[PDB]
Tab-separated table of C-alpha atoms in Angstrom:
chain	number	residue	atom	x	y	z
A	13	UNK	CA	0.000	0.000	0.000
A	14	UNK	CA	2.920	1.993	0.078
A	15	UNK	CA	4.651	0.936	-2.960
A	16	UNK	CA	1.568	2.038	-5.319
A	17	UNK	CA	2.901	5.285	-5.155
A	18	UNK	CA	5.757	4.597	-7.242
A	19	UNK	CA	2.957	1.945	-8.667
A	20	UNK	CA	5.177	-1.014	-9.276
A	21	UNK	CA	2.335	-3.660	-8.199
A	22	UNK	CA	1.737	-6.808	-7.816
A	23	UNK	CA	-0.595	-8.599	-4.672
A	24	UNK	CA	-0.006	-12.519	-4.182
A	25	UNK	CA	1.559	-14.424	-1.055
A	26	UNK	CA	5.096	-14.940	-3.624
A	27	UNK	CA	4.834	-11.351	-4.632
A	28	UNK	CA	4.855	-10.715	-1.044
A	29	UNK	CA	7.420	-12.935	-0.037
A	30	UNK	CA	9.727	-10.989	-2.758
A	31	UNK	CA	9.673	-8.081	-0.203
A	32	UNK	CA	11.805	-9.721	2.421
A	33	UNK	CA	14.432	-9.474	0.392
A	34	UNK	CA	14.353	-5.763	0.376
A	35	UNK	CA	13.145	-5.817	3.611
A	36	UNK	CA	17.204	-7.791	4.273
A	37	UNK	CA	18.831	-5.446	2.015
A	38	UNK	CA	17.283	-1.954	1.288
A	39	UNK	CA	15.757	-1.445	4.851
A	40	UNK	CA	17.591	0.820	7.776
A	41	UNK	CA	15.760	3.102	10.674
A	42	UNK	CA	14.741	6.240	10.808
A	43	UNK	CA	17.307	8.089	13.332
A	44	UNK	CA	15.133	10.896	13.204
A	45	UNK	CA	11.465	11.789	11.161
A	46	UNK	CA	11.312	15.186	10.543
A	47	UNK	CA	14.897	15.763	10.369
A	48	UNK	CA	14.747	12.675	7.661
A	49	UNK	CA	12.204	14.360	5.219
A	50	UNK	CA	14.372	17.120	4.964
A	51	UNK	CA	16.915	15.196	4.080
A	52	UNK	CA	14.402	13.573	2.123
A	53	UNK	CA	14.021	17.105	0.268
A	54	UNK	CA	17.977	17.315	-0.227
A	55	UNK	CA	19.080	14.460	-1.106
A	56	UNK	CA	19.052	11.014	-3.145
A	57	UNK	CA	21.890	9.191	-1.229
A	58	UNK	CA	18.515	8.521	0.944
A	59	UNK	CA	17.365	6.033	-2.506
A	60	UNK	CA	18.910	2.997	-3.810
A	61	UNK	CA	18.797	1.121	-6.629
A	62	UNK	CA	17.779	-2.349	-6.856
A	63	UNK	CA	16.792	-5.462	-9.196
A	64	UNK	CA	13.936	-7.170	-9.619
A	65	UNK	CA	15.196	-10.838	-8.363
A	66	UNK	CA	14.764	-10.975	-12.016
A	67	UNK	CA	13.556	-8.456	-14.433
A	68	UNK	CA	13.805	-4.682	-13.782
A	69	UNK	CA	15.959	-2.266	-11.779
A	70	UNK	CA	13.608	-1.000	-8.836
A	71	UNK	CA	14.876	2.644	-7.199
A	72	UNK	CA	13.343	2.803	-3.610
A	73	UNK	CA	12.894	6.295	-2.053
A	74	UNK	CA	12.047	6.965	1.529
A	75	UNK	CA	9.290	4.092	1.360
A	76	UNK	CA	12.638	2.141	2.676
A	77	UNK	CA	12.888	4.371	5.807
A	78	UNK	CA	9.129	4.811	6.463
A	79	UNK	CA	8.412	1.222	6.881
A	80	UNK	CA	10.327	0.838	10.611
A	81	UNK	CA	8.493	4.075	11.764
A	82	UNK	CA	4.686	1.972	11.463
A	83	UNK	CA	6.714	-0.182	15.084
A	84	UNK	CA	7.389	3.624	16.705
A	85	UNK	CA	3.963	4.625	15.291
A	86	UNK	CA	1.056	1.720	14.286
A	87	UNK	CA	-1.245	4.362	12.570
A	88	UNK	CA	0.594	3.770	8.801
A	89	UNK	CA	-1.701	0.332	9.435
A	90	UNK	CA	-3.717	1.629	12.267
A	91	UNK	CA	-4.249	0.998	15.890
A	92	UNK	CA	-3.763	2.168	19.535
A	93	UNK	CA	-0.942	0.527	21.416
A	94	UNK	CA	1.846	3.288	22.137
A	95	UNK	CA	4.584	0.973	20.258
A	96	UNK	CA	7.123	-0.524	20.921
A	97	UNK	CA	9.124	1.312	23.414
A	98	UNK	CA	6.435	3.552	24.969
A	99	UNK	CA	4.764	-0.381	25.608
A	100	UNK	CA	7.759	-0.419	27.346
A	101	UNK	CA	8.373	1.604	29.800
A	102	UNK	CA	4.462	1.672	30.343
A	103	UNK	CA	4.838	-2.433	31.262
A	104	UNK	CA	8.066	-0.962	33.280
A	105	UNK	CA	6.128	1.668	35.159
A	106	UNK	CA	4.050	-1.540	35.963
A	107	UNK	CA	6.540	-3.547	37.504
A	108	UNK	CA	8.009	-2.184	40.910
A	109	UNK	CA	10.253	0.822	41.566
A	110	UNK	CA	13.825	-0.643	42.655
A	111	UNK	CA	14.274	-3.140	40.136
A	112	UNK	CA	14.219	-0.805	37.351
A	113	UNK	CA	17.674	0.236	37.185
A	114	UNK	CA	18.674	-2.721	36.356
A	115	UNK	CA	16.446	-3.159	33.020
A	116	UNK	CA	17.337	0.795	32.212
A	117	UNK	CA	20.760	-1.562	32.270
A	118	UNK	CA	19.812	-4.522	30.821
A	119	UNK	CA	17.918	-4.773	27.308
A	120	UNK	CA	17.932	-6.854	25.271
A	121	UNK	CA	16.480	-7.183	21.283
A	122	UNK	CA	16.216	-9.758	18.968
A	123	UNK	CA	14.954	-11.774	16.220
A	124	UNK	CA	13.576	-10.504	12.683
A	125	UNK	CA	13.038	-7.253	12.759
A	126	UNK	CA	16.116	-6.200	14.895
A	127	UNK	CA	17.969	-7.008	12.599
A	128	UNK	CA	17.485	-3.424	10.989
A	129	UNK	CA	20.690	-1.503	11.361
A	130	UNK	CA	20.355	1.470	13.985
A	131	UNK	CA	16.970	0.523	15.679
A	132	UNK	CA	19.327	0.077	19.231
A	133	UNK	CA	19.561	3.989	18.773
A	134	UNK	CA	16.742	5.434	18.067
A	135	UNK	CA	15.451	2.901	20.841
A	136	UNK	CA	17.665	4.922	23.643
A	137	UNK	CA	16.798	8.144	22.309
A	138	UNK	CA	13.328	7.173	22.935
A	139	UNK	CA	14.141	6.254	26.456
A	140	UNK	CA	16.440	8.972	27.235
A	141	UNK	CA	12.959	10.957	26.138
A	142	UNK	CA	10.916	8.866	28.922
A	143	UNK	CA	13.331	8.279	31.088
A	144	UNK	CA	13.941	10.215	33.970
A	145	UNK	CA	18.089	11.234	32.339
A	146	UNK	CA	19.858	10.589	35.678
A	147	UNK	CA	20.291	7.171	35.627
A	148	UNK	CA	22.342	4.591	33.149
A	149	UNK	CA	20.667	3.241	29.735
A	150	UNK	CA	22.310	0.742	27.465
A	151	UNK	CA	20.766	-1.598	25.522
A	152	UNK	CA	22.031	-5.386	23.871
A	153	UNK	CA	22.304	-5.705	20.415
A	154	UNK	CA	23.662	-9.034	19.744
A	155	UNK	CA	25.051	-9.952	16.242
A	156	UNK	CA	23.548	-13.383	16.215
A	157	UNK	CA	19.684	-12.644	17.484
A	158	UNK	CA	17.772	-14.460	14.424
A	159	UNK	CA	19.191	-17.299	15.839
A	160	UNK	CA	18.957	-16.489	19.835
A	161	UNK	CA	16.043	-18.880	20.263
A	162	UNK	CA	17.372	-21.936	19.166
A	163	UNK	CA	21.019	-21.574	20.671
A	164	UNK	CA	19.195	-20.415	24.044
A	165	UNK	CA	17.449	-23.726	23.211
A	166	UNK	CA	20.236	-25.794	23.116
A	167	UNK	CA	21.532	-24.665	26.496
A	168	UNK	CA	17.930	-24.890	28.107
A	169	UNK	CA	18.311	-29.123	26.323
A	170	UNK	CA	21.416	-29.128	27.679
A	171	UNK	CA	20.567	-28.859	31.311
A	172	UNK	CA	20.267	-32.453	33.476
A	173	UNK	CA	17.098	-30.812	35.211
A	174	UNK	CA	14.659	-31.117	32.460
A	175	UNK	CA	15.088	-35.049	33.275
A	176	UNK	CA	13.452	-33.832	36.314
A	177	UNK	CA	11.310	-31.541	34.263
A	178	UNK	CA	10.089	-33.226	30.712
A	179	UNK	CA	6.838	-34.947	30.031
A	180	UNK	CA	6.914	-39.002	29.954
A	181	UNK	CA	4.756	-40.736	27.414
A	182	UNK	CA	3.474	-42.323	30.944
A	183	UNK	CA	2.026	-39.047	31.919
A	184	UNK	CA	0.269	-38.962	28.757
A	185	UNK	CA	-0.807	-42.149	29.000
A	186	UNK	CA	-2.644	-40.960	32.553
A	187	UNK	CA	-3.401	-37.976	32.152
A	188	UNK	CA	-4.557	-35.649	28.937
A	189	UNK	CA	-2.830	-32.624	27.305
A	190	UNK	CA	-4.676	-31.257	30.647
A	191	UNK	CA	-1.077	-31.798	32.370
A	192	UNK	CA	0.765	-29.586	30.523
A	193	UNK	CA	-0.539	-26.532	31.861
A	194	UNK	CA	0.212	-27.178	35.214
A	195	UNK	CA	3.126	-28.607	34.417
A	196	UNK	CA	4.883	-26.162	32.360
A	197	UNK	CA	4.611	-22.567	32.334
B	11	UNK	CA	13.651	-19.413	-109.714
B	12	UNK	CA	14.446	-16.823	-107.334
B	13	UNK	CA	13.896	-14.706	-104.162
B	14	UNK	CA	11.469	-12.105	-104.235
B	15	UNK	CA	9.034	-9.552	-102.921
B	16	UNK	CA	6.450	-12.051	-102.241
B	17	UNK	CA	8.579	-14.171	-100.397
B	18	UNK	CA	10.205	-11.090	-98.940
B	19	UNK	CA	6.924	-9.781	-97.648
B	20	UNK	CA	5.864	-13.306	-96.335
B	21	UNK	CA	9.142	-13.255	-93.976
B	22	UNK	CA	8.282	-9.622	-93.007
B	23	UNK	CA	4.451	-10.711	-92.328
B	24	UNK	CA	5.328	-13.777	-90.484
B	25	UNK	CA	7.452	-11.524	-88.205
B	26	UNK	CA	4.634	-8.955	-88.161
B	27	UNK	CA	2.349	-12.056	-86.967
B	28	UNK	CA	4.617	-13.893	-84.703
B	29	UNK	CA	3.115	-12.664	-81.018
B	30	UNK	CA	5.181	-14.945	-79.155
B	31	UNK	CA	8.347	-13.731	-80.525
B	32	UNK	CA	7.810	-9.934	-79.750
B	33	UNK	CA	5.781	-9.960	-76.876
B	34	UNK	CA	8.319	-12.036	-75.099
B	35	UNK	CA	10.881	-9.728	-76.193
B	36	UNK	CA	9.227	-6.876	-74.314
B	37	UNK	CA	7.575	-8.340	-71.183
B	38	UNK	CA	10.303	-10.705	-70.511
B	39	UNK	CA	13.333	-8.482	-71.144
B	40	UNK	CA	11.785	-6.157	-68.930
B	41	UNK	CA	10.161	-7.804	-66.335
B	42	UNK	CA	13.742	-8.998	-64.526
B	43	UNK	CA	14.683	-5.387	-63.410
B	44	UNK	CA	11.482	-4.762	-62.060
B	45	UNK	CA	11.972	-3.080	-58.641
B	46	UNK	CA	14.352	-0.831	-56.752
B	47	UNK	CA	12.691	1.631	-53.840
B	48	UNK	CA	12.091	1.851	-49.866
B	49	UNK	CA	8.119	1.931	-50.509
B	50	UNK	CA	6.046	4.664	-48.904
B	51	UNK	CA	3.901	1.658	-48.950
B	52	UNK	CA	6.132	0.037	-46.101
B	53	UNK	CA	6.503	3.515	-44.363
B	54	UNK	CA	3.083	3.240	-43.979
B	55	UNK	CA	4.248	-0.027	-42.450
B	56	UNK	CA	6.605	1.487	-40.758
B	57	UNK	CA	4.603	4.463	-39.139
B	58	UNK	CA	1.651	1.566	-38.287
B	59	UNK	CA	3.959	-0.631	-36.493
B	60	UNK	CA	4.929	2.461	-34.544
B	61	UNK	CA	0.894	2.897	-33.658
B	62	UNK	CA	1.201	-0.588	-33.044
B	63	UNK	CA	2.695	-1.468	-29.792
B	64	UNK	CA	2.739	-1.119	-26.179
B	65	UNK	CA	5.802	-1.736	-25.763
B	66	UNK	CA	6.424	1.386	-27.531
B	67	UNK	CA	3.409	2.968	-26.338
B	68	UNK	CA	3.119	2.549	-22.593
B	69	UNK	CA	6.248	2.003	-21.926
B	70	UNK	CA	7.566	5.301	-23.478
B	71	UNK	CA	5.540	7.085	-20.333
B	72	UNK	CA	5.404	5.127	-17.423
B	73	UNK	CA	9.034	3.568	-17.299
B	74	UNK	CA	9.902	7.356	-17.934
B	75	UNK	CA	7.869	9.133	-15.458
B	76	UNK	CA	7.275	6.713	-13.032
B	77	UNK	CA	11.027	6.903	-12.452
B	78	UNK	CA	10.546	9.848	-10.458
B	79	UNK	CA	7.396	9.695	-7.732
B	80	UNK	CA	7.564	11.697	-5.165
């Protein structure tokens, strides 16, 4: 619904799939908005140029940078939950007083679409906003994220406690999938 | 005893009548070079096929505007 405007077009789930491509190579975050669309009025180091996977050159404007903005602000595709960051400080300002130096410490990012160069800093400006400035903020921004689950997997498999922990076939046997939820979280 | 007028004008006559002979001489001779031009015929060829196709037609706009959006 964006890319209409430059009316290249095409709707099917492939056609849609084709995206993630760009969405790997063309995509980076917005450090700032305004300040962006005036660079957006300067300049055309702001657009690339890029194939088709085959067929045509494509030439992508600030459609590249606008697309992260829709996670600081969900109206592009609309709906009312603050985003991503003021979500989190509001489930922060939940959670008790004392502990929460220690997440203005520790925070942590992964998975698909972290892997966006820059949204780490735009994140901490966005806290230094709602944070009160006087105490520490860092975030973690790991290389390897898209992958975190599965390694963080391996070490939770690797762990002789789950012995104590798994399912047995012989719980199944006497009792339904009704054990799991007691059982696990 | 001799050769005359009469047969003189049967030879000329016969030519006179021979059809084949003449006729052949002038349409076949020059029916070989028949043809050297580029036709307005095929410009109009020409300027048609240019009508003709969108890959001329639409692509002459919107590959060269769409280029620039926004």
């Amino acid at each position: 619904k964006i890319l209409t405007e430059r009316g290249y077009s095409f709707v099917t789930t492939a056609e849609r799939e084709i995206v993630r491509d760009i969405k790997e190579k063309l995509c980076y975050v917005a450090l700032d908005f305004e300040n962006e669309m005036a660079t957006a009025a300067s300049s055309s180091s702001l657009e690339k140029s890029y194939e088709l996977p085959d067929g045509q050159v494509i030439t992508i404007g600030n459609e590249r940078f606008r697309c992260p903005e829709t996670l600081f602000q969900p109206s592009f595709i609309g709906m009312e939950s603050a985003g991503i960051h003021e979500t989190t400080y509001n489930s922060i300002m939940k959670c008790d007083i004392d502990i929460r130096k220690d997440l203005y410490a520790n925070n942590v990012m992964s998975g698909g679409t972290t892997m966006y160069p820059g949204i780490a800093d735009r994140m901490q400006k966005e806290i230094t906003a709602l944070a009160p400035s006087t105490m520490k903020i860092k975030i973690i921004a790991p290389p390897e994220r898209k992958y975190s689950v599965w390694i963080g997997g391996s070490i939770l498999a690797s762990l002789s406690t789950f012995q104590q922990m798994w399912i047995t076939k012989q719980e199944y046997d006497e009792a339904g999938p009704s054990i799991v939820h007691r059982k696990c979280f | 005893x001799x050769x005359x007028x009469x047969x003189x004008x049967x030879x000329x006559x016969x030519x006179x009548x021979x059809x084949x002979x003449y006729x052949x001489x002038x349409x076949x001779x020059x029916x070989x070079x028949x043809x050297x031009x580029x036709x307005x015929x095929x410009x109009x060829x020409x300027x048609x096929x240019x009508x003709x196709x969108x890959x001329x037609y639409x692509x002459x706009x919107x590959x060269x505007x769409x280029x620039x959006x926004x």
